[PDB]
């Protein structure tokens, strides 16, 4: 497990160096953009039980062929599995939202997830739909452009926080396919 405060002490390690005075600029900017970085998470996880139900039904009204027999989401048991793994995925990109590094996920969720939907035969293109539709709600929650919840905030720059939740969300799609 690593993060952006401890990524530099990995980076300074292998060349046998320290945390130099000019490398602090990503991290001195962190603690001042941390007051808005904590203002970003509670916008997401307040509505979180809807976020999987908004998205996986968005795969249902996109593709209704999966709730037929033969589909991987037919039976009443397997949708209890699916909604469970739907809300796993944003539970771990929310960790990297507070951590600022990808070293939370492909050591805890992505290492071998490509191969463990291989033997279960889970259609990986359908899981991409359950990744991107969650991502679309995420950037609309950060920039508050989603229609039917208006949350109070402090004004200022937030345009780069939604820029990185794209980078985490497509990565979990990048490694499942």
């Amino acid at each position: 497990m690593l993060d952006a405060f401890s990524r530099v002490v990995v980076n300074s390690d292998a060349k046998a160096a320290y945390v130099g005075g000019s490398d602090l600029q990503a991290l001195k900017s962190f603690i001042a953009d941390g007051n808005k970085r904590l203002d970003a998470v509670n916008s997401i996880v307040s509505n979180a039980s809807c976020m999987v139900s908004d998205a996986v039904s968005g795969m249902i009204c996109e593709n209704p062929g999966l709730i037929s027999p033969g589909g991987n989401c037919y039976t009443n048991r397997r949708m209890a599995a699916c909604l469970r793994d739907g809300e796993i995925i944003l539970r771990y990109v929310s960790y990297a939202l507070l951590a600022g590094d990808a070293s939370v996920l492909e050591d805890r969720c992505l290492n071998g997830l490509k191969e463990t939907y291989i033997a279960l035969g889970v259609p990986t293109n359908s899981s991409i739909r359950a990744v991107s539709i969650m991502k679309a709600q995420a950037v609309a929650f950060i920039t508050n452009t989603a229609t039917e919840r208006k949350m109070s905030f402090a004004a200022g720059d937030c345009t780069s926080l939604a820029s990185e939740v794209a980078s985490y969300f497509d990565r979990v799609g990048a490694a499942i396919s």
Partner: protein
């Protein structure tokens, strides 16, 4: 080029063969069922103290090099002792799948998932060895009566085996000494609602996994539950 045997120098096949991917889908499925039982251990964000690693300046780091080198011994087994616990772990893991055909689809598929789910179900219900101590010598001489019976599979012909092996270096099992005696104290001061399920489910843990028809042994379990909380499978020699 030619075969690896003659007329060629360096190694080949940097490609995950069909057996090699079977191990990884086993391991990912096993880390999931490992972490899922520990979610039943700590059910809040406040840690239950049965997750207490070490309690002195160095016992926490000392538990690391013992646990993986013990896992090295489970990897170091013979062809017989690997074929035995293949078939033996799974039919215990069949039994924990109480009335589910779906789980016994994939427990005959992934033998490490068979191995990873049988022992963690015990640690979820704390129906195992160091989680429940008897109350008096009424049951103390009774609970440790099967303890000398269990290690008969350990040393088969007098000569000891690597199942019950404790330390691999100088001064290792002596930190394991003082640790589990603290667990023997950590088993002594649990909650009131806690301890009144460890006994009343270890007397159900034996009656499904070990009894199989004997109504005499059900008298033994339902009056002495701590004698059943030591009973384990043939795969662990100890």
């Amino acid at each position: 080029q030619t075969g690896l045997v003659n007329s060629k120098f360096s190694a080949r096949m940097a490609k995950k063969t069909a057996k090699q991917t079977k191990n990884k889908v086993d391991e990912y499925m096993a880390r999931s069922v490992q972490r899922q039982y520990k979610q039943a251990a700590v059910a809040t964000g406040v840690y239950g103290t049965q997750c207490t690693e070490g309690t002195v300046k160095g016992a926490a780091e000392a538990s690391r090099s013992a646990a993986l080198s013990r896992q090295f011994r489970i990897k170091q087994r013979s062809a017989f002792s690997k074929a035995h616990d293949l078939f033996e772990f799974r039919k215990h893991a069949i039994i924990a799948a109480a009335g589910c055909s779906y789980e016994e689809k994939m427990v005959t598929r992934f033998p490490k998932l068979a191995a990873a789910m049988v022992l963690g179900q015990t640690e979820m219900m704390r129906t195992c060895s160091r989680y429940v101590v008897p109350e008096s010598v009424e049951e103390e001489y009774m609970a440790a009566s099967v303890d000398k019976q269990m290690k008969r599979r350990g040393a088969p012909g007098g000569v000891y085996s690597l199942s019950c092996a404790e330390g691999v270096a100088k001064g290792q099992a002596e930190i394991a000494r003082v640790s589990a005696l603290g667990a023997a104290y950590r088993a002594a001061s649990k909650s009131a609602s806690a301890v009144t399920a460890e006994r009343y489910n270890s007397m159900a843990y034996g009656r499904v996994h070990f009894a199989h028809g004997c109504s005499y042994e059900e008298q033994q379990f339902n009056k002495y539950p701590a004698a059943a909380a030591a009973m384990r499978s043939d795969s662990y020699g100890y």
